[PDB]
Design a protein around this ligand. Sequence first.
Ligand SMILES: Cn1ncc(Cl)c1C(=O)Nc1ccc2[nH]c(-c3ccccc3)nc2c1
Ligand SMILES: [Mg+2]
Ligand SMILES: [Zn+2]
Length: 314
Amino acid sequence: QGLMQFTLPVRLCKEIELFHFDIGPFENMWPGIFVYMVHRSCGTSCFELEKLCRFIMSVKKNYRRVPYHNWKHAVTVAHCMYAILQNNHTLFTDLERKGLLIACLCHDLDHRGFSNSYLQKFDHPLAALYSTSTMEQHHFSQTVSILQLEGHNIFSTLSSSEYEQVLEIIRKAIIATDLALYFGNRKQLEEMYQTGSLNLNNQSHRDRVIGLMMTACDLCSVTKLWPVTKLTANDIYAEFWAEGDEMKKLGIQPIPMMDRDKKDEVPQGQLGFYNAVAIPCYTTLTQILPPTEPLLKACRDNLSQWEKVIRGEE
Ligand SMILES: Cn1ncc(Cl)c1C(=O)Nc1ccc2[nH]c(-c3ccccc3)nc2c1
Ligand SMILES: [Mg+2]
Ligand SMILES: [Zn+2]
């Protein structure tokens, strides 16, 4: 280091601050974009550059060449967290700023492009090792494995205490990306917010709020400009339909979401998702963290675009 300030071209330097930033098709710039965000979000002091670069490159190696749950998704989800953190400067601890960008980079480590359900119906060994949040416990395990590689301990300077705290932020953050857990998390947050019992000094409350941030960052394709949203959907369905193909091979009719034969019903499926998951997610997030409102606004814009698709206005 340490007078070594990572800098991006002007258009990226400016647009990376915005919630709707797309990290672009130049895979080789994504490590630099991540380090830039860590340095601005956390400090040039939070990580040893050499260790951080080595960690980033081993995380990249441990993402697979799948249409959606790939390295680009990792860095995309990390950027959304970067935007939340930068818009809510004073709300987050030093350990949280460290832990959360890392959790986001690692949250789908070694994803195979298949749901927890598919692993369970296939009878994958991972489903016997982890009976709930199957892939998410795997992703946390892969994160700890990489932190334990030689020269990969980016947390080396933390005390025993702080190290256990940050790994517990990461573990909870990664488990929260199981969408099965999102519905109850958000219900409890919505009740807490409205009865005025929400207390960011209650650790168990902070945990829930970080869970919702994780869901929000994880679903952030719905908060992009429409051409990004639309082309990301294609990747999402490429996995869903491959999974449905695999369900048919086990002798199981897949849900329509995963049946490529029901392609025609995608636009209506997007409406349900926006209405049942996406919009409620960003709404409750905006209630808790008012400066995240652009995510809700962008989501609503994309809802309105899917409604136009149905009306054949596109
Ligand atoms: C955008 N996004 N981000 C993260 C995630 Cl999970 C997504 C997503 O697409 N979710 C989603 C959720 C439910 C759906 N149902 C259908 C569908 C239903 C009947 C027929 C054809 C399709 N498509 C769906 C797509
Ligand atoms: Mg995941
Ligand atoms: Zn993800």
